Amino acid sequence: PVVKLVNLILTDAIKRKASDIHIEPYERSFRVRYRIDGVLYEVMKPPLKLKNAITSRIKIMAELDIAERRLPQDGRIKIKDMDYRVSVLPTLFGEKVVLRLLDKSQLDMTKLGYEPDALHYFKEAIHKPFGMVLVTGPTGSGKTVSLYSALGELNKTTENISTAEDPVEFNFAGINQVQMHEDIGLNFAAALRSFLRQDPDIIMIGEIRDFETAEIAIKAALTGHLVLSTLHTNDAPATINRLLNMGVEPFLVASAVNLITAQRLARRVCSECKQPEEIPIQALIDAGVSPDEGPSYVCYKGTGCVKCNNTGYKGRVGFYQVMPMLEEIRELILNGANTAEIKRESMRLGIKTMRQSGLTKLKEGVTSFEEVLRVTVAD
Amino acid sequence: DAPVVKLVNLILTDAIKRKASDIHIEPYERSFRVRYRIDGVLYEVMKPPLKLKNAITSRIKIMAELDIAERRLPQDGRIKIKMDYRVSVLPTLFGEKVVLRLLDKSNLQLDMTKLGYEPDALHYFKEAIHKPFGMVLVTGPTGSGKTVSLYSALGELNKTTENISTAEDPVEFNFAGINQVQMHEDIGLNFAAALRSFLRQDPDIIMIGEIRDFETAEIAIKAALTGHLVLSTLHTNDAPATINRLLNMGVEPFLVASAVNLITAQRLARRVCSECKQPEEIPIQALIDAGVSPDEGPSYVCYKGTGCVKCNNTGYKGRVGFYQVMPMLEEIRELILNGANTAEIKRESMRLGIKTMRQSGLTKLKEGVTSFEEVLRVTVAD
Amino acid sequence: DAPVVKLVNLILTDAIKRKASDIHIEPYERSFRVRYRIDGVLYEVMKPPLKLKNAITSRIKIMAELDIAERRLPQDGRIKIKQDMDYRVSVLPTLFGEKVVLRLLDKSQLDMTKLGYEPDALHYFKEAIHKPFGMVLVTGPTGSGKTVSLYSALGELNKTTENISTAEDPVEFNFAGINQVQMHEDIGLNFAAALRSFLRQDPDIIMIGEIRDFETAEIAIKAALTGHLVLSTLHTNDAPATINRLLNMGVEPFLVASAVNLITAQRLARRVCSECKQPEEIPIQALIDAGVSPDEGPSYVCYKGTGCVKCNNTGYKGRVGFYQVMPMLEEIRELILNGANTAEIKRESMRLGIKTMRQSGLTKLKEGVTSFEEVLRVTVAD
Ligand SMILES: Nc1ncnc2c1ncn2[C@@H]1O[C@H](COP(=O)(O)OP(=O)(O)NP(=O)(O)O)[C@@H](O)[C@H]1O
Ligand SMILES: Nc1ncnc2c1ncn2[C@@H]1O[C@H](COP(=O)(O)OP(=O)(O)NP(=O)(O)O)[C@@H](O)[C@H]1O
Ligand SMILES: Nc1ncnc2c1ncn2[C@@H]1O[C@H](COP(=O)(O)OP(=O)(O)O)[C@@H](O)[C@H]1O
Ligand SMILES: [Mg+2]
Ligand SMILES: [Zn+2]
Ligand SMILES: [Zn+2]
Ligand SMILES: [Zn+2]
């Protein structure tokens, strides 16, 4: 009965073109709201007796902790396919649940916004016969799209590609995709060991979270396989310190990793209402613009039009830090250099930081100065 | 049983008739007293028998559904009497001290036009909260009416088309349609954790109780840049100094100029009792020193209450707000981006007609609603 | 009636007569002695026969309700003697017997004028604690007078119009009107939990016994900026070093610059006995090396006590405080935000006239309150 009601809330939202579902308890009421074309509408008022059953069911569908009701929790629901991003939030009179429709509908690497130098290092690293490629960033930074874009360039009938994902974001023909199931025993570590017995060529791990997974992944890269994975780290230099703090010996990181990227997703200025805004040149220089390049900058910002919902932005751009494991960086790891020394050395060799990549796209007029300062830290 | 039940109920009802905000039930080694906070000042209203020390505090526990067996640890609950009270139990060395916070929605005034804003200031505040995105900061110390200003703004925005989420420490009043979160930092639910959760909750309007550090300030500023309306508070000396506070926290100057729509500063002064109101012979030179023009000085008629039954013999009844409403004008924005300090931002705001809190206090002094000592206590000279 | 019973009573009462703070009963291989700590310095007061060491120790443990059967482990307890004197008893198992330490706990000044503050330092301290918000930090090593200074500040602020709440470990003196909470960590009542409960108790003034970790420091400094007056202590060695200690713990710089009203550093130095005192011929050059200006050098008259029965033949009777009272002046705030080190902060405070502890000691030397040897013993050179 309650399962039927929850399924109706989900199936009614896809029929009514809703992008978000809001299940909200209050002291004297309990309502469900759909966001349709940016506007919330009350679409249902279930009785107050059912609010515990409806919330628990959704938390079970999202594999969340039903015993904990005081802390925020975030999960995911897949229905057939429609995928929901679940967010639980402890209010005064119960838990509020928000489900956000994920619109899956460009896997092409040449259209992701990599600068030519960055795209060169990235393509060079994934076409090596073995080694590790790490794509880092926070949630919603485009990591998975970058990984799948790399798998597209590599997917040939001549190579065996196997992935361990939690969950499988997209179904790829020719790619052997395994979905994780921890309660049964199918985690990243178990899949990696089986992959080594599967005559593999390219291995993709959804994320390196623990030393047990890093150990097998590093070993697989040194054995002669190409290993791609992700981590949640601040930048590419800090990714090295993360692996070391997990217990991986420094010489194994120096020799196994081909390449580490760090990326953030910024908004692209609306091409219809963009126009220059007056920014003192000293502000640009304080943000990392060299004094010589300063005067040549034209910082664009959308004023807000109908083609962008009066936001001034339409679309997104990528700010990439593509750091190859250059020999200078390898020696620094072997000498136990800290994150600061590794970042400075990478900048000396021409590896642009995410801040510098953002200033480049600001120079090209495709993003605003506030976006650069919002998603990147200073160097 | 009944003598204590009657006494405890009398403690709760006399607080309502005196219009007190809080009740303090405090045991000591050789005494026992009850204090009401009336218009921000505590007063001794009762010295009950010390034999009833444990009986009185235990009765309120039962009303608050708290643990009578535990008397060594702090406890917190709520009471509804057929008027709501928030209860806080503190274990001192001579018994449990109980504090009760009166929460009457009926007494709360939420219409923005009845909060005491001057019409030009009210226009800029309303314009700021009805913009689709940006940040609005209401500054002042705790107990300066900031939450009422925020609740008034949220009530003006509480439509079924928007999702409003608040993070409060604690939640003073609850409103239908508004998703409110009470902070519980002992278990990890601080302002930052609730802010990052709000960003995954598909928000439209976000209210934060106070911005206390760089981490929360960064999430708040950047949420105001990504299409959300952000309402929050800080404790600063005035509206112009709120700019320097954010910069010192670590926020980039360009993001402050881009994200903030408006900053207000406010203080709560006590309102002179209308019945015992009498003219006070404040020397003209004292008024000129406070900021009154010398040509206006002799015309000023300062008032103060002599004390009567209607005002609990305090001379005051109610509160008035001294407001400074500073919109993020383009002139002020250009000052921020050129590294201007607090003094030159304050001069620029006064140049453009933005009244300071001292000027707002002196206006209320001229109208006879507040006293000369209240103006000097809560405001500084310009 | 028994010999040892009378002897133990003599040791306990003689300490009260001599104004001792601590009693040390120490057995060694070939000797046995009793030492009193008088004005912070230990003196041998008795040499009882070593044969009696087990009877004296056993007798004290009976009065302290300690276990006489156990002689290999440390034990702790209390003793109350009848007008009452309390003793905190600590037993320690040395190689040649059990050592016993007794700590006298006597309430028997409250007045700030009798503690040793110079008029300028007193003015800065009084205006800082009378502000409606901010943090006041009293720093110094153990036994430097921090609790007395805070109790003295609370006494000047103890009004019926304000709510004062303290978290102490332990509570050392009971004040009517002040809500004092004693820490009990084993049940979860620590400084952090008590401070969080105070914030739900409608506070005005909060006193935290000591800041011993970053978690408590952040809560306390943020509560002060929210709009409360907060008093606490740290174990640092001067006022400028307290600034960097807070920063090194992880407190954000804007919090230190904007939320701290004032920081004090202090040491206790012994006073020359008024009965004993005689002038001491200190070479004028030696005074100059200690930090006295050349103009003032020849005018100094330094005194030293020869020793009399009234001062226990030490030349010193009582103690006085050397205070460095540093208000958070605007010049100092700019240094916190610009990353200055302790030496820069110290040089700048001296430039603005903030007297160091050494200079305060030299002031007491000129006035004949303390001796030249005491200034060099308890203060470092600048
Ligand atoms: N280069 C890009 N430019 C613009 N948008 C992008 C880009 N790459 C990905 N996106 C968008 O990012 C969204 C999904 O981001 P995603 O790659 O899932 O983040 P993520 O890093 O995988 N988060 P998580 O899986 O929780 O670690 C998609 O809807 C894409 O439209
Ligand atoms: N200004 C003063 N002049 C003379 N004597 C003082 C002064 N201040 C305190 N004392 C005495 O010296 C002793 C100092 O103890 P107290 O003030 O508790 O030190 P404290 O800093 O609290 N030590 P601790 O709590 O262990 O860090 C007390 O017994 C006071 O009676
Ligand atoms: N403009 C006003 N006029 C009269 N009373 C007010 C006004 N603003 C606030 N108050 C009262 O003062 C009390 C304290 O205000 P509140 O906003 O809760 O404190 P803070 O400013 O610390 O958030 C409230 O309970 C409210 O009833
Ligand atoms: Mg102490
Ligand atoms: Zn547009
Ligand atoms: Zn009256
Ligand atoms: Zn003497």
Residue numbers in the entry:
A (entry chain D): 182 to 261, 267 to 291, 294 to 567
B (entry chain F): 180 to 261, 268 to 567
C (entry chain C): 180 to 261, 266 to 291, 294 to 567
Sentences from the paper on this structure:
Despite the importance of the T4aP and related systems, little is known about how the motors of these machines work. It is thought that the energy for pilus extension and retraction is provided by hexameric ATPases in the cytoplasm, known as PilT-like ATPases. PilB is thought to promote the polymerization of PilA monomers into a long helical filament; this polymerization leads to pilus extension. Here we determined crystal structures of PilB from Geobacter metallireducens under non-saturating nucleotide conditions at 3.4 and 2.3 Å resolution.
Crystals formed when AMP-PNP was added to a final concentration of 50 μM to a 120 μM solution of PilBGm—a ratio of 5:12 nucleotides to ATP binding sites. The crystals diffracted to 2.3 Å in all three dimensions. Six chains could be built in the asymmetric unit, which together formed an elongated hexamer similar to the previously identified PilBGm hexamer. The overall structure of PilB:AMP-PNP is similar to that of PilB:ADP, in that it has four closed and two open packing interfaces. PilB:AMP-PNP is distinct from PilB:ADP in that only two closed interfaces have ADP bound, and they are bound with partial occupancy.
